[PDB]
Amino acid sequence: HMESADLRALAKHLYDSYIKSFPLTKAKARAILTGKTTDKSPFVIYDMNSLMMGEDKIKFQSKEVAIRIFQGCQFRSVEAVQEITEYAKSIPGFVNLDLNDQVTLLKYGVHEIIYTMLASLMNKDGVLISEGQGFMTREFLKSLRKPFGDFMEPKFEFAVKFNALELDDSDLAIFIAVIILSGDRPGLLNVKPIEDIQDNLLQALELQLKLNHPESSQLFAKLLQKMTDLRQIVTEHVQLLQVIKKTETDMSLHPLLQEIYKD
Amino acid sequence: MESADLRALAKHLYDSYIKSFPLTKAKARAILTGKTKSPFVIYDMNSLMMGEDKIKFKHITEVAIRIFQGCQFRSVEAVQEITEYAKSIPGFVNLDLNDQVTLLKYGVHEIIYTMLASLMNKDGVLISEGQGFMTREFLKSLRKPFGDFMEPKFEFAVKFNALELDDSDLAIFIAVIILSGDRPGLLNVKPIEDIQDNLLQALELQLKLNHPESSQLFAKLLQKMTDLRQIVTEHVQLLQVIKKTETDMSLHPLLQEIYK
Numbered sequence: 001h002m003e004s005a006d007l008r009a010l011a012k013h014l015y016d017s018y019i020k021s022f023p024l025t026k027a028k029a030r031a032i033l034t035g036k037t038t039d040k041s042p043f044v045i046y047d048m049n050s051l052m053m054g055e056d057k058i059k060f061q062s063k064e065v066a067i068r069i070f071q072g073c074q075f076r077s078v079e080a081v082q083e084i085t086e087y088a089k090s091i092p093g094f095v096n097l098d099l100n101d102q103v104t105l106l107k108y109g110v111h112e113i114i115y116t117m118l119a120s121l122m123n124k125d126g127v128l129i130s131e132g133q134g135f136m137t138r139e140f141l142k143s144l145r146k147p148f149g150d151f152m153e154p155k156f157e158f159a160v161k162f163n164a165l166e167l168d169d170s171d172l173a174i175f176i177a178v179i180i181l182s183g184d185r186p187g188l189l190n191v192k193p194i195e196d197i198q199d200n201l202l203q204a205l206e207l208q209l210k211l212n213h214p215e216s217s218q219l220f221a222k223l224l225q226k227m228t229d230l231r232q233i234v235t236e237h238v239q240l241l242q243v244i245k246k247t248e249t250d251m252s253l254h255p256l257l258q259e260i261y262k263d
Numbered sequence: 264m265e266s267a268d269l270r271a272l273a274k275h276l277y278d279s280y281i282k283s284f285p286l287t288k289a290k291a292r293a294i295l296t297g298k299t300k301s302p303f304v305i306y307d308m309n310s311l312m313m314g315e316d317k318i319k320f321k322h323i324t325e326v327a328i329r330i331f332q333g334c335q336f337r338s339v340e341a342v343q344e345i346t347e348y349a350k351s352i353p354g355f356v357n358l359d360l361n362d363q364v365t366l367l368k369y370g371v372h373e374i375i376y377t378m379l380a381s382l383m384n385k386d387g388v389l390i391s392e393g394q395g396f397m398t399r400e401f402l403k404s405l406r407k408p409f410g411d412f413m414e415p416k417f418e419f420a421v422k423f424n425a426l427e428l429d430d431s432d433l434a435i436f437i438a439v440i441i442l443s444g445d446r447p448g449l450l451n452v453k454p455i456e457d458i459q460d461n462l463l464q465a466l467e468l469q470l471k472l473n474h475p476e477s478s479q480l481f482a483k484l485l486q487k488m489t490d491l492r493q494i495v496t497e498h499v500q501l502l503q504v505i506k507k508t509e510t511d512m513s514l515h516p517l518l519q520e521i522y523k
């Protein structure tokens with residue numbers, strides 16, 4: 001379909017656009033987590049005592065611990081949504097689709113993209129926080145009370161599987177675009193121009209993975225298989241989030257997040 | 264720079280401007296002058312309702328709000344078109360990534376205004392890739408703040424269009440605006456001004472050859488370019504009040520974010 005030079009051109013454009021949209025890249029994330037650096041070294045939060053020390057050193061709040069951590073996640077999810085929305089507008093064709101479908105695409109795409117990109121901040125042991133100045137261990141989160149502990153762990157369960165593919169940012173730039181331009185989102189009005197955009201992005205992705213991971217067979221297929229998984233991990237996330245917002249009146253959802261979930 | 268090099272640079276920008284922008288000034292002017300397949304005319308409430316049904320808008324979920332949202336939709340599309348075109352300006356893509364973002368951030372409004380003049384005459388503006396034409400008098404007549412939000416763009420376009428620039432003139436003009444070294448927060452001004460000096464040389468030579476009878480056309484066009492600065496700040500002020508006064512103009516949070 002599209003000539004190789006044209007698909008590579010699209011790859012560069014999306015990567016270029018991804019760097020400009022997302023503050024904390026996967027390459028930076030790994031430089032912080034992989035050490036051999038004194039300047040990019042994170043403060044590690046692994047228990048109540050180090051959390052309290054963390055509020056002074058890192059500088060990110062009268063509520064309980066698990067709530068405070070939850071709002072720190074959602075604050076960051078909200079910014080991600082803003083960041084993903086800005087990235088979407090740079091995808092060729094996105095801003096020319098029917099305005100209703102843009103909203104529909106973001107509405108159903110932002111959560112899947114957040115999980116994908118949260119994996120970049122994670123290893124088996126914890127997650128980068130506060131633009132990489134902090135690092136909160138998996139076990140500390142898992143140990144949070146009532147429902148909140150099991151609300152945090154599935155994000156890690158995914159990331160460990162997802163990071164095994166060993167993608168870099170230039171791969172993620174195309175993958176993330178493919179997710180947004182899904183024609184099977186409920187309630188879309190013109191599936192066809194959305195599918196046309198995704199076809200080029202898929203072509204661009206396949207070529208990119210072949211070139212950047214030549215010794216890695218069927219990475220395309222393996223990467224697409226993870227992409228539909230996200231559908232269920234997301235609804236399972238919304239399931240827990242719905243039950244949480246039943247017990248907890250001290251949770252406030254952000255209006256941006258709120259509207260995404262009314263649907 | 265050698266004269267041949269300025270002509271090559273002018274040609275490169277024109278060729279690129281044609282690939283980036285769907286509806287050129289020459290196509291627009293054939294349509295507005297009855298020299299072409301006639302556009303649907305929106306001149307009042309009743310023709311507006313017929314027009315969204317015939318013309319088929321993509322902005323469509325009060326009247327003045329909906330027209331406002333169609334302007335916003337089209338501006339967002341323009342921003343991506345200008346962004347693509349920028350990558351074709353020699354040297355742009357080698358600048359620091361942050362400075363690229365800063366230049367586009369402040370340049371898009373001035374270019375949108377400038378290029379909107381291409382779609383306008385004294386009596387209205389082309390919409391929907393030239394298939395429609397919405398009259399100035401209808402736009403001026405919209406209620407509360409919206410009427411006076413629309414008219415200043417026409418007041419600019421009429422003055423700007425008196426310079427009678429073509430697409431090959433504009434192709435360089437737009438490049439010069441983008442490569443403004445005085446944008447707030449730039450990290451490395453020197454290569455931005457170095458490129459703008461080249462663009463300015465090419466513009467000066469372009470205007471002399473394409474408008475030999477037009478003395479100080481260069482100077483007059485640079486004067487408009489700085490006008491754009493204040494016209495844009497007045498625009499963003501009104502634009503801020505609209506998405507602030509009209510709380511129903513802060514509709515869906517997603518939509519709000521799309522138009523942040």
Ligand SMILES: COc1cccc(COc2cc(C(=O)O)ccc2-c2nn(C(=O)c3c(Cl)cccc3C(F)(F)F)c3ccc(Cl)cc23)c1
Nearest residue numbers: 069070072073074076077080114115118127129136152155
């Ligand atoms: C300052 O305190 C902190 C403490 C721990 C972790 C972090 C940073 O966490 C993130 C960082 C980024 C980013 O920077 O890209 C994106 C997403 C999350 C994140 N979000 N999230 C949701 O539950 C979530 C999600 Cl996925 C989507 C929508 C809404 C929500 C919500 F509202 F319900 F929260 C997590 C659950 C568990 C974990 Cl470990 C991490 C997360 C900060």
Ligand SMILES: COc1cccc(COc2cc(C(=O)O)ccc2-c2nn(C(=O)c3c(Cl)cccc3C(F)(F)F)c3ccc(Cl)cc23)c1
Nearest residue numbers: 330333334335337338341372375376379388390413416502
């Ligand atoms: C029902 O649908 C329509 C009704 C009327 C006109 C149009 C097409 O209008 C355009 C076409 C093109 C293009 O295709 O090149 C570029 C810019 C505008 C446009 N933008 N604009 C802004 O206010 C504006 C500006 Cl200048 C710069 C940045 C941001 C904004 C914004 F966000 F606030 F909108 C206008 C105000 C009045 C008018 Cl008459 C026209 C415009 C469609």
